[PDB]
Amino acid sequence: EKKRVSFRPMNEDDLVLMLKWLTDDRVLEFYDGRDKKHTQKTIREHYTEQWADEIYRVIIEYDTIPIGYAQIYRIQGELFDEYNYHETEEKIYAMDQFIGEPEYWNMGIGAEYCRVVCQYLRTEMDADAVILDPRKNNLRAVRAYQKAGFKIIKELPEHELHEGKKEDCVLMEWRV
Ligand SMILES: NC[C@H]1O[C@H](O[C@H]2[C@H](O)[C@@H](O[C@H]3O[C@H](CO)[C@@H](O)[C@H](N)[C@H]3O)[C@H](N)C[C@@H]2N)[C@H](O)[C@@H](O)[C@@H]1O
């Protein structure tokens, strides 16, 4: 009887939603940055680019309402160097995500989405670990990920250019 967080593959029609969310300064403060001036063209170019061999773009849904976005990609090849993550034979996925409808913030939805997608990547992709790299100043997001079982592994100084500053991030990892 409990409402469920789910996700589904992003399709071309969802680019309308993405334009709405990523021209909303409330969202851009936490994802992409308020200095980014998105258009239909930039959204298409950036959100259909296949910059990894294995990438899934998904719409996060709560009670069938589309409320956010995630990108999930297998770390392979040069992608390991982007996290100074030592390559082994383990299968590693990284993820970025945002909730674009702010009325669904601070409801535990972020942590619950993390739990659902980790169980999916484990059971359907045999993922060994899932990694995240939130900004250190986003303690809300760090706390939410830790509640979903992501362990803090190490700090990533000057990791992410965000609104004109190189921000320190936190490497976080889920295994079980
Ligand atoms: N989490 C919030 C942030 O998430 C993304 O940033 C992520 C990059 O996408 C990843 O990089 C991959 O995508 C790049 C193109 O974007 C490629 O150049 C690169 N080779 C790819 O490995 C990088 N590893 C982690 C970083 N968190 C958004 O971009 C950023 O706006 C948003 O605020």
Residue numbers in the entry: 3 to 178
Kindly provide excerpts from the paper associated with this entry:
The monofunctional counterpart (AAC(6’)-Im) of the acetyltransferase domain of the bifunctional enzyme has been identified in both Gram-negative and Gram-positive clinical isolates 14. It shares 60% sequence identity and 83% similarity with AAC(6’)-Ie. When expressed in the Escherichia coli JM83 strain, AAC(6’)-Im produces resistance to a wide range of clinically important 4,6-disubstituted aminoglycosides with minimal inhibitory concentration (MIC) values 8 - 128-fold above those for the recipient strain. Here we report the antibiotic susceptibility and kinetic profile and the X-ray structure of the AAC(6’)-Im acetyltransferase in its apo form and as the binary kanamycin A complex, and classify the enzyme as a member of the AAC(6’)-I sub-family C. An analysis of the structural features involved in substrate binding provides insight into the modulation of the activity of these enzymes.
The AAC(6’)-Im structure was solved in both the apo-form at 1.7 Å resolution, and as the binary complex with kanamycin A (AAC(6’)-Im-kanamycin A) to 1.95 Å resolution. The kanamycin binding site is in a shallow highly negatively-charged pocket in the molecular surface. Strands β3, β4 and β5 form the base of the pocket, with helices α2, α3 and α4, strand β6’, and the loop between helix α3 and strand β2 forming the walls. The kanamycin A molecule is anchored by twelve hydrogen bonds, four to the A ring, five to the central B ring, and three to the C ring. The A ring is further stabilized by a hydrophobic face-to-face packing interaction with the side chain of Tyr34 which serves to help orient the ring such that the N6’ side group is positioned correctly for acetylation. At the opposite end of the substrate, the C ring is also held in position by a face-to-face hydrophobic interaction with the side chain of Trp54 from the α3-β2 loop. Despite the fact that there are only two sequence differences between the two enzymes in the vicinity of the binding site (Asp35 and Glu85 in AAC(6’)-Im are glycine and aspartate, respectively, in AAC(6’)-Ie), there is a significant shift in the orientation of the substrate in these two enzymes. When the kanamycin A conformations are compared it can be seen that in AAC(6’)-Im, the A ring (containing the N6’ site of modification) is rotated approximately 45° relative to the A ring position in AAC(6’)-Ie. This, in turn, moves the B and C rings in AAC(6’)-Im towards helix α4, Asp136 and Glu85. A hydrogen bond between the N6’ atom and the side chain of a conserved aspartate (Asp99 in AAC(6’)-Im and Asp105 in AAC(6’)-Ib) serves to orient the nucleophilic nitrogen atom so that it would be correctly positioned for direct transfer of the acetyl group to the kanamycin molecule in both of these enzymes.
